Amino acid sequence: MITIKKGLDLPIAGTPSQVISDGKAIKKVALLGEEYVGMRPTMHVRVGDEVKKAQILFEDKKNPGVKFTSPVSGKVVEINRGAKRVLQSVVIEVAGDDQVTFDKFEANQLASLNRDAIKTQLVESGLWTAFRTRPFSKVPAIDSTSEAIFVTAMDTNPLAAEPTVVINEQSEAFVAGLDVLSALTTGKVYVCKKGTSLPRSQQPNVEEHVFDGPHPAGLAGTHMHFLYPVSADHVAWSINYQDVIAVGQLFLTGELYTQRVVSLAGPVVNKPRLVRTVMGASLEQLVDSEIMPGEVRIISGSVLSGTKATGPHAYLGRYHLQVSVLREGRDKELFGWAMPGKNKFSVTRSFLGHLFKGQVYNMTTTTNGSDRSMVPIGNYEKVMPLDMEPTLLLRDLCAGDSDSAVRLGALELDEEDLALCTFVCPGKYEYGQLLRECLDKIEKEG
Amino acid sequence: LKKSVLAPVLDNNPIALQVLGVCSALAVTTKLETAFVMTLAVMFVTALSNFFVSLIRNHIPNSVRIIVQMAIIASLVIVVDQILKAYLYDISKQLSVFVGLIITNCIVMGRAEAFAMKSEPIPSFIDGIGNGLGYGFVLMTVGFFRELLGSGKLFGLEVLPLISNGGWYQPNGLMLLAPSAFFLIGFMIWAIRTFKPEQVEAKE
Amino acid sequence: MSTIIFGVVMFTLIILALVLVILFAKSKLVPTGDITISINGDPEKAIVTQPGGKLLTALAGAGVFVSSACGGGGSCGQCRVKIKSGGGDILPTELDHISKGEAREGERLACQVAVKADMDLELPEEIFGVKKWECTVISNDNKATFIKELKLAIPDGESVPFRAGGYIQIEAPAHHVKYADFDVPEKYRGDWDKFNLFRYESKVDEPIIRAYSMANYPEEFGIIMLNVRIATPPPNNPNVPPGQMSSYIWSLKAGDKCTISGPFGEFFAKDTDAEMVFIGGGAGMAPMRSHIFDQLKRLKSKRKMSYWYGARSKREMFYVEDFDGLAAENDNFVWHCALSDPQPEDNWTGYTGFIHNVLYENYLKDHEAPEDCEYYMCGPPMMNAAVINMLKNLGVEEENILLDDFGG
Amino acid sequence: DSIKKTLFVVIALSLVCSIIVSAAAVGLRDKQKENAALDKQSKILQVAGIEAKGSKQIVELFNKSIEPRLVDFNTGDFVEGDAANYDQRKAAKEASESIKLTAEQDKAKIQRRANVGVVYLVKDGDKTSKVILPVHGNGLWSMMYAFVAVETDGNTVSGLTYYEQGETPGLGGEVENPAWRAQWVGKKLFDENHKPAIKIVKGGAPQGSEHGVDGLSGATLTSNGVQNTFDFWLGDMGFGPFLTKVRDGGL
Amino acid sequence: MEHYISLLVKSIFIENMALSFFLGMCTFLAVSKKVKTSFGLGIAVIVVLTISVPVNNLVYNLVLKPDALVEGVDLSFLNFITFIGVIAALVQILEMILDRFFPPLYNALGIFLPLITVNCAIFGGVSFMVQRDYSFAESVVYGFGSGVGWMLAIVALAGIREKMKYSDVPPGLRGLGITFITAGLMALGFMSFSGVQL
Amino acid sequence: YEAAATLFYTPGLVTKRSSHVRDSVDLKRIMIMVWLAVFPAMFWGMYNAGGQAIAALNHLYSGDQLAAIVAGNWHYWLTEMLGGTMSSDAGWGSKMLLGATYFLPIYATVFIVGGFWEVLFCMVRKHEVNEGFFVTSILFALIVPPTLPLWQAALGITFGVVVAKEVFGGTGRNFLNPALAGRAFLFFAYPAQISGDLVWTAADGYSGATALSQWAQGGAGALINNATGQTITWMDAFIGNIPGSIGEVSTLALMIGAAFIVYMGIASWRIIGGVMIGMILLSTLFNVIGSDTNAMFNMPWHWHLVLGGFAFGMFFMATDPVSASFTNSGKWAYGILIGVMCVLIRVVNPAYPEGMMLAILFANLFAPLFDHVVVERNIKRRLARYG
Numbered sequence A: 001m002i003t004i005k006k007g008l009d010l011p012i013a014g015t016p017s018q019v020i021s022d023g024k025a026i027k028k029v030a031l032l033g034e035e036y037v038g039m040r041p042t043m044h045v046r047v048g049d050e051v052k053k054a055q056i057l058f059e060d061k062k063n064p065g066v067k068f069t070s071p072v073s074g075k076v077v078e079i080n081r082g083a084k085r086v087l088q089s090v091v092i093e094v095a096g097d098d099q100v101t102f103d104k105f106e107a108n109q110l111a112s113l114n115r116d117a118i119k120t121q122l123v124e125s126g127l128w129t130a131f132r133t134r135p136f137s138k139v140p141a142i143d144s145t146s147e148a149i150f151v152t153a154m155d156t157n158p159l160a161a162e163p164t165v166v167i168n169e170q171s172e173a174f175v176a177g178l179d180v181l182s183a184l185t186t187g188k189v190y191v192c193k194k195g196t197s198l199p200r201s202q203q204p205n206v207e208e209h210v211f212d213g214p215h216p217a218g219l220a221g222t223h224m225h226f227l228y229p230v231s232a233d234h235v236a237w238s239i240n241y242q243d244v245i246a247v248g249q250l251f252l253t254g255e256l257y258t259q260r261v262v263s264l265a266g267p268v269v270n271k272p273r274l275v276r277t278v279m280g281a282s283l284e285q286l287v288d289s290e291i292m293p294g295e296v297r298i299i300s301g302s303v304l305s306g307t308k309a310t311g312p313h314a315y316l317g318r319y320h321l322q323v324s325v326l327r328e329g330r331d332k333e334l335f336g337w338a339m340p341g342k343n344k345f346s347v348t349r350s351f352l353g354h355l356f357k358g359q360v361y362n363m364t365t366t367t368n369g370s371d372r373s374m375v376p377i378g379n380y381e382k383v384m385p386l387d388m389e390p391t392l393l394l395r396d397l398c399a400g401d402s403d404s405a406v407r408l409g410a411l412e413l414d415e416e417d418l419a420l421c422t423f424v425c426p427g428k429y430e431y432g433q434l435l436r437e438c439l440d441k442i443e444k445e446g
Numbered sequence B: 001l002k003k004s005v006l007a008p009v010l011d012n013n014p015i016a017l018q019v020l021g022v023c024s025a026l027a028v029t030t031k032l033e034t035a036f037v038m039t040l041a042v043m044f045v046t047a048l049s050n051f052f053v054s055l056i057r058n059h060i061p062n063s064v065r066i067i068v069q070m071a072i073i074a075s076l077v078i079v080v081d082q083i084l085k086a087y088l089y090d091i092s093k094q095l096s097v098f099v100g101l102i103i104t105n106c107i108v109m110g111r112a113e114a115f116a117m118k119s120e121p122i123p124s125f126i127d128g129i130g131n132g133l134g135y136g137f138v139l140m141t142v143g144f145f146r147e148l149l150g151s152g153k154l155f156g157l158e159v160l161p162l163i164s165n166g167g168w169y170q171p172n173g174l175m176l177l178a179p180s181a182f183f184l185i186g187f188m189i190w191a192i193r194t195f196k197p198e199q200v201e202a203k204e
Numbered sequence C: 001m002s003t004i005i006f007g008v009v010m011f012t013l014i015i016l017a018l019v020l021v022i023l024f025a026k027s028k029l030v031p032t033g034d035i036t037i038s039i040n041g042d043p044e045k046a047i048v049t050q051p052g053g054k055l056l057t058a059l060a061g062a063g064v065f066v067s068s069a070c071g072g073g074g075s076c077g078q079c080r081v082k083i084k085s086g087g088g089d090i091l092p093t094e095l096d097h098i099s100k101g102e103a104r105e106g107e108r109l110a111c112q113v114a115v116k117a118d119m120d121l122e123l124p125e126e127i128f129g130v131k132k133w134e135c136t137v138i139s140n141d142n143k144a145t146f147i148k149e150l151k152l153a154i155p156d157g158e159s160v161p162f163r164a165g166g167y168i169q170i171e172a173p174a175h176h177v178k179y180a181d182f183d184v185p186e187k188y189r190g191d192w193d194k195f196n197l198f199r200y201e202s203k204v205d206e207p208i209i210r211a212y213s214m215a216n217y218p219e220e221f222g223i224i225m226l227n228v229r230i231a232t233p234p235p236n237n238p239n240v241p242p243g244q245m246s247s248y249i250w251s252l253k254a255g256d257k258c259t260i261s262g263p264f265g266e267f268f269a270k271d272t273d274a275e276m277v278f279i280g281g282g283a284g285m286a287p288m289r290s291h292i293f294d295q296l297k298r299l300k301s302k303r304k305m306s307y308w309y310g311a312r313s314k315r316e317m318f319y320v321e322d323f324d325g326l327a328a329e330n331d332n333f334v335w336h337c338a339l340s341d342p343q344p345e346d347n348w349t350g351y352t353g354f355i356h357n358v359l360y361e362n363y364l365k366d367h368e369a370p371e372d373c374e375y376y377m378c379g380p381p382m383m384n385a386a387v388i389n390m391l392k393n394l395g396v397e398e399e400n401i402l403l404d405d406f407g408g
Numbered sequence D: 001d002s003i004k005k006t007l008f009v010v011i012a013l014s015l016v017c018s019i020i021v022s023a024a025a026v027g028l029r030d031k032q033k034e035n036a037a038l039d040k041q042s043k044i045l046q047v048a049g050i051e052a053k054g055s056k057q058i059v060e061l062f063n064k065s066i067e068p069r070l071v072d073f074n075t076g077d078f079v080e081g082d083a084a085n086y087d088q089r090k091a092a093k094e095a096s097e098s099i100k101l102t103a104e105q106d107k108a109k110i111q112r113r114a115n116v117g118v119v120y121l122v123k124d125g126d127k128t129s130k131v132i133l134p135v136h137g138n139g140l141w142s143m144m145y146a147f148v149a150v151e152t153d154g155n156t157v158s159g160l161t162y163y164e165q166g167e168t169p170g171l172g173g174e175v176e177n178p179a180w181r182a183q184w185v186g187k188k189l190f191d192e193n194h195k196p197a198i199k200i201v202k203g204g205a206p207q208g209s210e211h212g213v214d215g216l217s218g219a220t221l222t223s224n225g226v227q228n229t230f231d232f233w234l235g236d237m238g239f240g241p242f243l244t245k246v247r248d249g250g251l
Numbered sequence E: 001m002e003h004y005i006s007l008l009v010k011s012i013f014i015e016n017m018a019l020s021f022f023l024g025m026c027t028f029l030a031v032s033k034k035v036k037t038s039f040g041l042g043i044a045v046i047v048v049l050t051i052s053v054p055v056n057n058l059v060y061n062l063v064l065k066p067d068a069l070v071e072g073v074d075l076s077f078l079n080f081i082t083f084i085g086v087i088a089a090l091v092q093i094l095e096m097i098l099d100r101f102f103p104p105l106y107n108a109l110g111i112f113l114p115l116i117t118v119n120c121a122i123f124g125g126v127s128f129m130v131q132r133d134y135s136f137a138e139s140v141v142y143g144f145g146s147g148v149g150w151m152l153a154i155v156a157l158a159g160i161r162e163k164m165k166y167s168d169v170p171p172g173l174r175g176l177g178i179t180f181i182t183a184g185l186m187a188l189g190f191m192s193f194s195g196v197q198l
Numbered sequence F: 001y002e003a004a005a006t007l008f009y010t011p012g013l014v015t016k017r018s019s020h021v022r023d024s025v026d027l028k029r030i031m032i033m034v035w036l037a038v039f040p041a042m043f044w045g046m047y048n049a050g051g052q053a054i055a056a057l058n059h060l061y062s063g064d065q066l067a068a069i070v071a072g073n074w075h076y077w078l079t080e081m082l083g084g085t086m087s088s089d090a091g092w093g094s095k096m097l098l099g100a101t102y103f104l105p106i107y108a109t110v111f112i113v114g115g116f117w118e119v120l121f122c123m124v125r126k127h128e129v130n131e132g133f134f135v136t137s138i139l140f141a142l143i144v145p146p147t148l149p150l151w152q153a154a155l156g157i158t159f160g161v162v163v164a165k166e167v168f169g170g171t172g173r174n175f176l177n178p179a180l181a182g183r184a185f186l187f188f189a190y191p192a193q194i195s196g197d198l199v200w201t202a203a204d205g206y207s208g209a210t211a212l213s214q215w216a217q218g219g220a221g222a223l224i225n226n227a228t229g230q231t232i233t234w235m236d237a238f239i240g241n242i243p244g245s246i247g248e249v250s251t252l253a254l255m256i257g258a259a260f261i262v263y264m265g266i267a268s269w270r271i272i273g274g275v276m277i278g279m280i281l282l283s284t285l286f287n288v289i290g291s292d293t294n295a296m297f298n299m300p301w302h303w304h305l306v307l308g309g310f311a312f313g314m315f316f317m318a319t320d321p322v323s324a325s326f327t328n329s330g331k332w333a334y335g336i337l338i339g340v341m342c343v344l345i346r347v348v349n350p351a352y353p354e355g356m357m358l359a360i361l362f363a364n365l366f367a368p369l370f371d372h373v374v375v376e377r378n379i380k381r382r383l384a385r386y387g
């Protein structure tokens, strides 16, 4: 329905063959600590303690009431802490199947459940941590209520799992989740999907809008900027579709639903495909026997925006649905920058690669060139379909200004939205951290 | 003794720390002696205006104090212009309007208001002499460079033999234009700030 | 001569015509009326100001001595005043000190406000509220080498209303004090004779005021006790003038009369159920001894206490007869002390070195509830700088650490 | 009271300031006018060639030798008037005392012309040796003025000094260069057909030419300004009839 | 009317006060922090110059020109004080009239008026006008052109210094030095029109 | 040398932060590609200067005076020693060598002095000595007349690098075109050496006006080449046989060089389109109005395109990424402005016979105002919540 013109697709080899196959056994699950932006934990477990599924692990100091639950039952083994004793990951060892049961419901009553009961059930089950507000991408406080729940039912990240295949196996659960969201929203529920067909909710609160085009069309930021512009005085909530499935199954069966479907793909994957696992799964265990020999890098989340998961961070993120493995490169090539490379990709037409339409590249992690001052040759303006001024906004963010950025429109953005901007930067900057610091300052000053 | 005379020379120079009073300094320095005459005029006018204002500060009509200082400064400036026209006609021809610009000059108005209005006449006169010296320093040491590199002359005395007279130096014609004075003042204040680090401004 | 008189009369007529127009503009168009302001909504008293008068000047003339030390220029920022009605033109100077946290209600700066209309104020009751007590000195004994414990009694046996951690202000008139008359016992004569502080002398010609925290918890009625250190010149520049008010306090002897002005305070203790950790050094004993006695004798709190003090030697230590008894009486309170460099005469058998090193090794290194506890810090700045640095290194937020630097 | 006190002090200050400033301004008018006359006299004497130094010497030499007059442009004959205190600039500025030129004839681009003109005769005895004609015309960046010292014959130039111009120094402001000013001696103004013969030759003129003069290197626009100035003020619209009368005699 | 438009264009670009005659730089450099502040002070300067020059031409043609009021007496030595006083009073009256009658218009210009009531730029314009001997309408057009040219200069410099938020100025030159340097380059750029015959 | 490794090699770093994949483009590639696009223009400029020198010499002199001239000046005897010929039948190789003996010293001096200033500043400020200077040096070497004394070029490049680029903080921080600041310092400091008739044709004793100055004096019929007496045709003035500066003589070579960078996305086509449309509109308006004294009023747009420095300016020099406007509408307006200013200065200013550089210096000031206006309108549209 809405056509995005400016945008960039990433032709990186090793697309996942969209056939669900049962993934390898997993024995360690964990919760990351850094990605829950603005959360300082108050611990509730100690090394050696035994917990069950959906049991409380810790709570948030500056966001009271919210409880983060243990994905699987077992025994706590490792509590890693980094510099300044900041929490990194709470490691749970898989053992047994004990859990905690919750109230059940029928399908018909789902559309008329009370907001207070829904909030209490979601918070106690721990699934409430799925919602990310805008601005500031923070988990919503237990009492607030928005006017639009954005259900991201489409994915356009590189090597991303196809949502249609995953949803078509859980149609009843998706219907239940949409009914619950329509009862909770206090307003409208926008579900953004491609041209294909998805299971339908009968409530009149649910609106279906269709986006078409390159990568920036599959993000809550773009959905919101095009359908319900977020401001400092008008907040909206975003939730990925598998969390909707989990909500539906939770309200239908009375127990937490911890399954996941992630796309294990990349340049150095022997056989890319969809695998079935539990959130927080140890990528070290999951990637066994699926990788070619050589130095490699495990990335939770897409190659555009992800976390270098080696060590305490080697665990699948809460808000991530894909695993990308790509080959590391440390070769200093003579005349590499001036070599008219056939295999050197560029959105700019400055290389012979763009002549061969449809080519697939064997990408690496090298950063061509080094850090230099940004010279706006006109690259940011090709990859921002939003009605924002990219060249001015990026200079403003780099200058450290805060109120000017807020006026310019830095509120709608997020960490993952500037991924293309840092991807195309001639100066090889990283804008995610700059935007995060600016948003932190804006939130802290008032 | 006379520490107040040398106090405003560098610590609080009116065009280095303060910004007031550059309209003359921007365009009267095309020659050295015109700037010298302007500096002497500023000294005399500032000193006498501070003297008289501090004399009359007790019975001031505070509602029109600005008008009263402007009246006294006009009475001084018109007399100065008359004397310059009568005895220094050749120099007064070059100055033209800028000798009349002294009436509105920010340094003299600010020193009449801030210090003369609330101070004893002798300190008022001494402070006027001091800031006149501080202003004349930058006038002399901008005019020196401008005249030397625009005509190879000083006070009309020729130093570098010009090409047109069979010498070896060619006059850089940019020094007769304003941007040369702008750049000279900028590099000068950079030198002053790097040799007196205490005046460095913050990033914000 | 004809030109001279003609020019003179035309000059006079011109300036008179100009000034009459200016006066007509400034007298027939501007309100020329007095302005009325209200200090608070509830009281009926209203302060009369002028359209051309500044708010700070008007308050000073009316006698409302709001916080101010410069009168303008943004040097201090103490002139911030709460309002409930006023103009929307916020000056850049006001905005420099007023962030968006205060811009929601739009409070202004007193030295930058001109009352052009009938606005209202919302000043705190204390803005116009303070007290005073002519306190007779009972004793000024020496408990440390460089610290005198002054003891003051409020007349009529009226205990001042204050909270543990407050500070009084003491006024000192112009006087000259030699250091020859100070009473220091033979125990502390070691350092003074070596450094020869007796040859100094103070010189104060104008009244001054300073702040000093109480050393007594409120249930001790009718006693104002402090721990005042000497503000001696540093051993690097002996020619600098010495401490003005500190020389005055040390000069105060038993039986003399002194004046104090009202209980103040901002360095308080939070009302929670979390562990309290007190860390002390130097003359920071006066504030801490107040709270520990407060939570143990007034509130009878059951929470976990711990107090840590650093000292140069065993002759700099005091008050522990109360502290040892407090630890003996109560199980919640456990105290420890450490000396920087001990002397062979003390026969010290205990913790040594800097206090931040001591508290880390013994307690914080093996603690299992890091950050979960509150800390109270007061003393010399370098002790303060080290402790905040390590507490940040152990990962504690700024809300839990609550320090009190004695004027930098 | 307050208002009366303010009025009284303001009036008193106005009176004292007025009297001092008026005395100061009245005292020096004669000296200022003398200085202006001295400047003009020095320029004219340097044009003529009579050496002079110092105010008194300049004054006595000018009063002994030079003798200002007035000339009517239309008929080229002397008129009666205060030749000493004439102001051709303001006379041309006045709408009543100056005609308006047309775009066809205004070669010099001055667009106005005073109705009465001024010259400066040089006299050594009863006779006349030189006649000096003030001329002006538009250059490139500003107005330009000069005196041209014509011999008593009516065709020979004996000097030229550009006493007011604003061209770029070194490149266009070469008009004051003595090596260029001395180039005008011996040259002639009118040909054998009494037509304007002065011509600035681009690229340099042959030495000892009848009516040539070297152009300003890299300054052809200022050269054209000078050429237009002379070609206009030596035509019939300018000093033409007066120079014809000089050639006839009676000077 | 070719003459009025030509004079407007001349007073706008060919004779820009702040970058061809170089006056008013104390305020020019200090106010240049904000684009909006510079625009407001520029509108104040132009609205001042709409009336500062015409009334001065009236006064000069009426009572100050040589032998204008009585034959044989010249009164040209009072021009300095008469000009400064007249401009000051005539802008004070306008400011107070706007404040009393149109507060919405006054808030846009009264912030800068008490500080620029007397300045270098207005006096320079008045003196140059008196030197050039305009008429009443030509004076009005000259003021309305020169003021807008000054406003254009200050607005452009403010925009440049706003764009300077990205530059790494050396510590010694931070602030005043870099302002003077960039004003120099701005004048270098503005030197283009100096030769136009109009 | 050790420092040559930083140029001949890639850094070989790995993505440390979140965005693990980066594009292959970089500042070194951009600047080197621009430095490799003016090569046709410069390789034609050398030959053109050589041909003009040969034509002027063999028109002015003949016989033994040729030997007298070549023995005195150094370029001619250097060419003869290297194996060329000064006769009327000089081959293209000899013409190119004679042009090179003029172009190369200026480039070497500019490079050495500018590199000295760059290295000193970047060593004091401890920054990484970056690229960009390769473009600046070659541009300032290409926009100067052939017979510039070397010290004037050194002073010009010192000004344009220190007072305009380095003092602001280096590449990406400046706001005025550095090469143009240096050229303007030279232009307003020594006008006798960068303007007139004696400078453009690199000969001894040859004075002749160039193509633009002739039209202002005598209309289209005055476009005559004094060296041979043949009228200058549009094909000549477009293929680059005119006597002019050393860089912009050949519009065709400039277009061939600029096509690759424009197609490469390095130079924004919006600026070029704005310049073209502004120049066309102003030329058409002036032509329609017409005049009977200022004959430049009737020069059509197609005659305006190839004359002077318009081609070089618009293609390689107005398209500076760091000084131009940043928003797209700002770029369009900026191109319009420089085109209009160039035509206006060309037509209605008699002192200067060309104004592309002055137009660029003027519009560099007003580009940020354009971007601010556009961004303020965008902010208004955003506060309206519908965008």
Ligand SMILES: Cc1cc2nc3c(=O)[nH]c(=O)nc-3n(C[C@H](O)[C@H](O)[C@H](O)COP(=O)(O)OP(=O)(O)OC[C@H]3O[C@@H](n4cnc5c(N)ncnc54)[C@H](O)[C@@H]3O)c2cc1C
Residues within 6 Å of the ligand: C167, C210, C211, C212, C213, C214, C226, C227, C228, C229, C230, C231, C232, C233, C234, C240, C241, C242, C243, C244, C245, C246, C247, C283, C286, C287, C406, C407
């Ligand atoms: C809320 C609060 C509570 C406080 N509680 C206490 C308390 O309980 N006990 C306590 O001891 N203090 C306390 N203080 C600190 C208080 O400021 C003391 O009065 C302090 O010791 C200053 O002493 P003074 O006024 O005698 O010396 P000051 O005159 O204020 O300063 C003297 C010091 O400055 C140096 N000095 C003086 N003149 C110069 C000069 N021209 N150049 C350089 N150096 C110079 C001297 O060498 C000496 O070190 C408290 C402060 C606050 C704000």
Ligand SMILES: Cc1cc2nc3c(=O)[nH]c(=O)nc-3n(C[C@H](O)[C@H](O)[C@H](O)COP(=O)(O)O)c2cc1C
Residues within 6 Å of the ligand: D140, D141, D167, D168, D171, D172, D173, D217, D218, D219, D220, D221, D222, D223, F187, F188, F191, F195, F196, F197, F209, F213, F350, F351, F352, F353
């Ligand atoms: C800064 C500058 C100032 C100039 N000033 C003048 C000048 O005042 N008078 C003049 O005739 N030419 C001046 N010129 C040169 C002319 O503008 C023009 O370029 C040249 O004279 C035309 O060639 P030609 O005079 O040899 O025919 C100046 C040139 C420049 C660059």
Ligand SMILES: Cc1cc2nc3c(=O)[nH]c(=O)nc-3n(C[C@H](O)[C@H](O)[C@H](O)COP(=O)(O)O)c2cc1C
Residues within 6 Å of the ligand: F143, F195, F200, F210, F211, F212, F213, F243, F244, F245, F247, F248, F307, F308, F309, F310, F312, F313, F317, F352, F353, F354, F355, F356, F357, F358
């Ligand atoms: C980008 C650029 C800008 C130029 N700007 C000017 C200028 O402003 N003034 C000038 O006299 N010559 C300028 N020139 C040089 C002219 O193109 C030319 O050399 C000279 O002006 C005479 O022009 P002509 O040879 O086309 O007749 C510039 C050249 C270039 C390449």
Ligand SMILES: Cc1cc2nc3c(=O)[nH]c(=O)nc-3n(C[C@H](O)[C@H](O)[C@H](O)CO)c2cc1C
Residues within 6 Å of the ligand: F030, F031, F034, F132, F135, F136, F139, F165, F170, F171, F172, F174, F176, F177, F178, F179, F180, F266, F267, F316, F317, F318, F319, F320, F321, F322, F323
């Ligand atoms: C397409 C392009 C054109 C450039 N043009 C110029 C130019 O005309 N002058 C210059 O000094 N630098 C030029 N540069 C170099 C650089 O961008 C410029 O100097 C910056 O403003 C940094 O000083 C150019 C660079 C590119 C990529």
Ligand code: FES
Residues within 6 Å of the ligand: B020, B021, B022, B023, B024, B104, B105, B106, B107, E023, E024, E025, E026, E027, E120
């Ligand atoms: S700016 Fe010139 S005197 Fe104030």
Ligand code: FES
Residues within 6 Å of the ligand: C067, C068, C069, C070, C071, C072, C073, C074, C075, C076, C077, C078, C079, C109, C110, C111, C112
């Ligand atoms: S009282 Fe200090 S800034 Fe106002």
Ligand SMILES: [Ca+2]
Residues within 6 Å of the ligand: D089, D143
């Ligand atoms: Ca004139």
